[PDB]
Amino acid sequence: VLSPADKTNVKAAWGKVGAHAGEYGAEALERMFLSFPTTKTYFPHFDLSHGSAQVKGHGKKVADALTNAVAHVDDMPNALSALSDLHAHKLRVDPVNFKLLSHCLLVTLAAHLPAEFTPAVHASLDKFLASVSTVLTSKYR
Amino acid sequence: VLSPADKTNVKAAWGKVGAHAGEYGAEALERMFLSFPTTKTYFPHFDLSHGSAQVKGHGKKVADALTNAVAHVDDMPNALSALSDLHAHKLRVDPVNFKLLSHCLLVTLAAHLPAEFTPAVHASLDKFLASVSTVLTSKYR
Amino acid sequence: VHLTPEEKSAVTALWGKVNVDEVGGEALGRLLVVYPWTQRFFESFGDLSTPDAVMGNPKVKAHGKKVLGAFSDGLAHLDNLKGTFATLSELHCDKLHVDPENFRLLGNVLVCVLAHHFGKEFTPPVQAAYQKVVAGVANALAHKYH
Amino acid sequence: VHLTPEEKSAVTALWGKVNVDEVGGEALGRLLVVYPWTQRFFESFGDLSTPDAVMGNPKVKAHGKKVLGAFSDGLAHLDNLKGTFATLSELHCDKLHVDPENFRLLGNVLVCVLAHHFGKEFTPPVQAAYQKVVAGVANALAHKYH
Ligand code: HEM
Ligand code: HEM
Ligand code: HEM
Ligand code: HEM
C-alpha cells in the first residue's frame, strides 16, 4: 500500500503522462529490450525491432494496465489478479525482470516529465511500480 | 499472496516450533551473525558471543514476533506496524538482511524438523518469511 | 572467497558424507518448488506439474547429480573457482541467460538441504563455512556476466 | 561488460554536457530519498530527517561531487574499471560494508538523473550504453566481495 502523499504524487505524474501512456509504454519496453537484452527471450514470437507494430501494441497494453492500477491503487491485487496468473504462473517471468521494466518506466517518465519528476515523485513512482510488480509476481491459489 | 495451502503449511510447521521458539530463534540469529558477519553491525551494543544471554533474549522476541505473524497472516501488516517503524524507519536495516535471517531461520528449522521441512512446506515457509520481510521493510506510517 | 584451513577441512569432512546420487536432485527439485520461475529453465525436463512431480522427476535428479559434481570440483580446488567455472559461467550467462541472483538461491537451497540431512551436525560454524563455498561458486558462475 | 565504439562515443559526448557540481549531488540525494536504508551510511552528514532535508543537505551535495568524480574516472578508463576502482572497492566492502546491490541502485538512479536532465536526448540506445557503464562500475566496486 501507498501513503496518502504517494498516491497524490503518482496521480500527478501519471495525469501528466495522460494520453501519451501507450507511447511511453512502448518506449519503456524498447529501453528495456536494448538495455537488458535478456528480457527479449520472454517474447520469442515478437518482432522487437525499432518502431515495430507489436511493441507499440504491447506498450499500449502495459500502459493501459498501469492506468487501471492507478485508478485502483487501494486494491491492485484484485484489479490486477489476471496479470499475476499470466506473468507468474503461465510465463514464469523471473522477478528480476520487473525491476528492469520498472526502472525503464522511471527512466521514460524522467525523460518526459522534466518538471514533475522530482525526488519525492520519483520515490513515489518507484514504490507504486514495485507495488505493481509485487502483485504480478505473486501466486495464491 | 499466502494461498490457503501456504497458510495451512506455515501454521502447520510453526505450530511445531513449540517450546523451542526462543531456542531456534536464537540459533537462527547466531547462524546469521557467524555466516554474514556484516549483520552484527546492527547490534553494536549487544554481546554477540557464542552463548550470549542477549542473543538468547533477543532470540525469544524474534520468535514471538513470528508466532503473532502466523496468527495474523491475513493481516500481518497490522500485527507488525510497530516492528516496521522500528526496523525500516528508525534502524534503517538494509533489506538484504531480512533475506539472510530468513535463510537462517529456514536452516534452523530444517536442521531441527526434517519431516516438517518438506519441499512444499519449505516453499510455504519461505513465502511467509518473505512476506514478513516485505512488511518489516514497508512504508505507509 | 577465503576459507580458513579449519573451515576448509570442515566442508571437506561433511561433503565426504554426502550421497552424491541424491543431494543434487534434492537441491534442484527444491529450487524449482520454492522459486517457481526457475522451472522455465528446465521445461524440457518433463513433468514439473506439482511439487511431487518435480521431486520425483528423473531428468531433474540426473541433472541434479551434474550440479553436485560441479560443486564437488569447486570444493576440490577452492583457490580457483573462476577457472574451474569459466566455461560454466559462459554457458549459464550467454547461452541460458540465467539471472545471477538465482545462483545465490540455488546455493542457499543447497545449504538448507545439507541442514535438513545432517541435522544438529550442520552447526553454525559449518554453515558459515559452506556459505563462503556457496557464495564463491555463485560468484565464479556470474563472472561472464561482468 | 564492453561498450561498442558508438556506445563509447555516445557516452563520452553526453557526459561533456553534464553539470559536474550538481549531477552527483542530485543522484546521491535521490538514492537516500528513494532507498531510505542507505541513509544509515551517511548519519554523520547531518540533517537527513525528511526527503527535503536530504535533497538540501550540503555534505550530501558535496560528497556527490566526489561520487561523480569517480564515475568520470571509471568513464575515462572503461576497459579497466577493476583497477580504477580497486581502492574504492576496498573501502566500500571491507571498511563500510555496503551491500553491492546498492551499487546497482546508485547507478540506476544516476541513469534516471541523466534522463531527467537531458530528456529526449537520453535515447534508448544512449541509455543502454550508460547501463553497461553503471553495471561495470557497480561490478568493479563489488570486486573485493568476490
Ligand atoms: C510494470 C509491469 C508490467 C505490467 C503492468 C505488465 C502488463 C502486461 C499486460 C497488460 C499484458 C497483456 C496480458 C494479456 O494479453 O491478456 C502483458 C503481457 C506480457 N508481459 Fe507483462 N507487464 C509487466 C511486467 C512484465 C515483465 C517484467 C516481463 C518480462 C521482462 C513481462 C512479459 C510479458 C509477456 C511475455 C507478456 C505476454 C506477451 C505475449 O506473448 O503475448 N511483463 N503484460
Ligand atoms: C524475521 C525477521 C525479523 C523479525 C521477525 C524481527 C523481530 C524483532 C523484534 C521482535 C525486535 C524487538 C522489539 C522490541 O522488543 O522493542 C527486534 C528488534 C531489532 N531487530 Fe529485528 N527482526 C527481524 C529481522 C531483523 C534483521 C534482518 C536485523 C538486522 C540484521 C534486525 C535488527 C534488529 C535490531 C538491531 C533491533 C533492535 C535491538 C536492540 O538494540 O535492542 N532484525 N526485531
Ligand atoms: C550456482 C550453481 C550452479 C551450478 C553448480 C550449476 C551447474 C551446472 C552444470 C554442471 C550444468 C551442465 C552443463 C553440461 O553438462 O555441459 C548446468 C546446466 C544447466 N544449468 Fe546450472 N548450475 C547452477 C545454477 C543454475 C541456475 C540457478 C539455473 C537456473 C535458475 C541453472 C540452469 C541450468 C540449465 C537450464 C542447464 C541445463 C540445460 C539442459 O541440459 O537443458 N543453473 N548447470
Ligand atoms: C556505485 C557507485 C559508487 C561510487 C562511484 C562511489 C564513490 C565514492 C567516493 C569516490 C568516495 C570518497 C572517499 C570517502 O569519502 O571516504 C566514497 C565514499 C563513501 N561512499 Fe560511495 N560510491 C558508490 C556507491 C556507494 C553506496 C551505494 C553507498 C551507500 C549505500 C556509498 C557509501 C559511501 C560512504 C558511506 C562513503 C563515505 C565516507 C565518508 O563518510 O566520508 N557509496 N564513495
Side-chain angles (χ1 to χ4, degrees):
Chain A
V1 209
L2 301 176
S3 81
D6 288 321
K7 303 159 120 73
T8 294
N9 290 342
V10 176
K11 291 181 177 143
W14 208 259
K16 202 51 169 53
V17 165
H20 297 291
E23 295 155 87
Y24 286 13
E27 185 177 325
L29 286 166
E30 236 221 297
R31 293 182 176 277
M32 172 184 75
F33 292 136
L34 291 174
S35 271
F36 316 95
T38 52
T39 60
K40 293 155 61 191
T41 80
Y42 281 93
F43 304 70
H45 304 353
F46 278 49
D47 175 323
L48 305 183
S49 64
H50 174 46
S52 85
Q54 286 190 302
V55 166
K56 288 185 68 198
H58 208 75
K60 161 182 165 63
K61 292 169 187 213
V62 169
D64 288 349
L66 284 169
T67 296
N68 176 44
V70 172
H72 292 85
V73 62
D74 286 296
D75 196 37
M76 296 209 270
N78 253 321
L80 303 175
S81 191
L83 294 174
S84 38
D85 191 356
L86 180 281
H87 296 70
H89 189 277
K90 186 174 186 290
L91 298 170
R92 263 104 162 64
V93 188
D94 182 322
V96 71
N97 296 294
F98 292 85
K99 303 182 174 179
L100 302 167
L101 183 56
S102 288
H103 168 77
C104 293
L105 281 169
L106 284 186
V107 178
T108 294
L109 265 36
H112 282 281
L113 319 187
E116 25 287 311
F117 194 75
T118 57
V121 165
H122 173 183
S124 291
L125 284 179
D126 184 74
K127 194 170 308 305
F128 164 68
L129 290 174
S131 302
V132 159
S133 293
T134 283
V135 163
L136 301 196
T137 54
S138 80
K139 269 203 302 175
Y140 58 118
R141 25 276 175 252
Chain B
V1 189
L2 276 290
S3 75
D6 287 329
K7 286 188 285 162
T8 308
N9 288 350
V10 168
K11 285 199 54 55
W14 192 255
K16 286 246 177 301
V17 171
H20 293 212
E23 182 189 312
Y24 298 165
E27 186 190 319
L29 282 175
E30 179 171 44
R31 276 172 188 292
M32 172 187 78
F33 300 131
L34 220 49
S35 287
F36 309 106
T38 290
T39 61
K40 301 201 268 76
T41 75
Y42 280 102
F43 301 74
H45 298 158
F46 279 56
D47 176 320
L48 295 177
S49 86
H50 183 70
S52 153
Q54 292 196 291
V55 180
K56 285 181 171 62
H58 208 74
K60 323 264 150 300
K61 293 164 180 286
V62 180
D64 298 351
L66 293 164
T67 305
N68 186 69
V70 146
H72 252 95
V73 52
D74 273 286
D75 213 280
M76 312 196 327
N78 248 287
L80 306 180
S81 172
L83 291 177
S84 192
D85 291 314
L86 172 71
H87 296 83
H89 180 70
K90 184 171 177 284
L91 302 180
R92 301 313 198 189
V93 200
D94 180 305
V96 64
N97 296 289
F98 298 92
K99 302 205 190 306
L100 308 176
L101 177 54
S102 287
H103 159 68
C104 291
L105 269 304
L106 288 189
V107 178
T108 309
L109 273 34
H112 284 272
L113 305 190
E116 225 79 4
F117 201 75
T118 76
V121 155
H122 172 173
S124 293
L125 271 44
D126 188 78
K127 190 159 187 160
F128 172 67
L129 293 172
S131 294
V132 163
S133 293
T134 282
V135 175
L136 294 189
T137 54
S138 278
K139 250 207 61 176
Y140 60 134
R141 304 313 322 140
Chain C
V1 71
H2 180 72
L3 266 71
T4 66
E6 212 286 277
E7 299 172 312
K8 190 155 193 299
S9 76
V11 293
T12 303
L14 192 84
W15 196 251
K17 291 147 79 153
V18 154
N19 173 337
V20 79
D21 312 303
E22 209 72 27
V23 178
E26 234 125 46
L28 233 196
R30 276 170 192 267
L31 171 98
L32 306 184
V33 176
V34 175
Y35 311 104
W37 58 89
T38 57
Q39 291 179 35
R40 177 175 186 272
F41 288 97
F42 310 90
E43 270 163 354
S44 57
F45 281 23
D47 198 6
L48 305 178
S49 74
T50 69
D52 287 342
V54 174
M55 297 318 295
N57 183 295
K59 279 183 172 186
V60 169
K61 317 171 159 297
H63 196 65
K65 190 172 174 44
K66 274 185 252 272
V67 182
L68 201 288
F71 260 97
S72 286
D73 307 325
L75 173 45
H77 299 285
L78 296 166
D79 279 324
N80 38 146
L81 281 356
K82 173 197 180 177
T84 298
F85 292 106
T87 48
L88 255 203
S89 180
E90 243 170 84
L91 164 79
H92 287 83
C93 297
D94 304 313
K95 177 168 177 53
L96 300 167
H97 308 300
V98 171
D99 185 75
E101 172 58 21
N102 303 298
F103 307 152
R104 179 202 240 177
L105 297 180
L106 182 55
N108 282 164
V109 153
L110 167 55
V111 166
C112 284
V113 170
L114 290 169
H116 181 276
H117 290 293
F118 295 103
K120 312 276 189 52
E121 202 171 320
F122 191 67
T123 54
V126 159
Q127 189 205 316
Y130 261 97
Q131 295 291 174
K132 289 173 181 187
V133 166
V134 142
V137 171
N139 285 310
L141 210 54
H143 211 283
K144 280 51 199 172
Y145 263 143
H146 322 146
Chain D
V1 68
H2 169 212
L3 286 74
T4 65
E6 351 153 57
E7 283 166 333
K8 174 158 158 173
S9 298
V11 160
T12 302
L14 194 92
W15 199 252
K17 320 173 64 176
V18 162
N19 183 336
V20 77
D21 289 339
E22 303 315 279
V23 171
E26 238 264 319
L28 178 43
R30 278 181 184 251
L31 181 90
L32 287 184
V33 168
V34 181
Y35 308 107
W37 61 95
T38 52
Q39 289 171 31
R40 171 159 189 287
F41 290 105
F42 300 94
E43 298 170 314
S44 65
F45 284 32
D47 204 3
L48 295 182
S49 75
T50 68
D52 297 312
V54 179
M55 294 316 299
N57 184 293
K59 265 153 176 275
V60 163
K61 182 53 47 155
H63 186 80
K65 283 202 62 165
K66 307 185 156 61
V67 177
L68 206 72
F71 276 101
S72 280
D73 187 22
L75 235 22
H77 304 38
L78 291 179
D79 293 294
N80 180 44
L81 301 173
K82 293 297 176 297
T84 294
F85 292 89
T87 54
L88 275 185
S89 170
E90 206 178 298
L91 165 68
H92 287 76
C93 307
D94 306 318
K95 324 155 201 320
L96 306 167
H97 305 287
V98 176
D99 188 81
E101 236 304 300
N102 298 300
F103 300 146
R104 189 207 147 229
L105 293 186
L106 180 48
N108 277 169
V109 331
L110 165 62
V111 164
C112 287
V113 176
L114 293 175
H116 190 227
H117 183 278
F118 303 105
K120 194 181 210 263
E121 273 172 37
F122 204 68
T123 74
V126 162
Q127 183 192 345
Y130 270 97
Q131 294 287 180
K132 281 187 189 180
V133 169
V134 141
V137 169
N139 304 327
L141 266 159
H143 190 59
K144 296 312 202 304
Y145 268 123
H146 303 164

